[PDB]
């Protein structure tokens, strides 16, 4: 099966969190987002 909605967005990094939340919530009105700072080793 496949998860509908934009399964992979572009790269709005630094494009304001709220902004990205609008594009993600607008593309997949069936998914929520969570804001969090950095800490764990993320894909460098």
């Amino acid at each position: 099966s496949s998860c509908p909605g934009k399964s992979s967005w572009p790269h709005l990094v630094g494009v304001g969190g709220s902004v990205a939340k609008a594009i993600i919530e607008r593309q997949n009105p069936n998914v929520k987002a969570v804001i969090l700072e950095e800490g764990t080793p993320v894909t460098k």
């Binding site: 909605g5 967005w9 709005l12 969190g17 997949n28 987002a33 969570v34 993320v42």
Partner: peptide, 24 residues
């Protein structure tokens, strides 16, 4: 719990929001 219904967004104190291009 990173499902296709939960998007995590990271933010670097540098004053930027590192949002993962993908969901989980």
């Amino acid at each position: 719990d990173f499902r296709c219904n939960r998007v995590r967004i990271w933010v670097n104190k540098r004053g930027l929001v590192v949002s993962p291009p993908r969901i989980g």
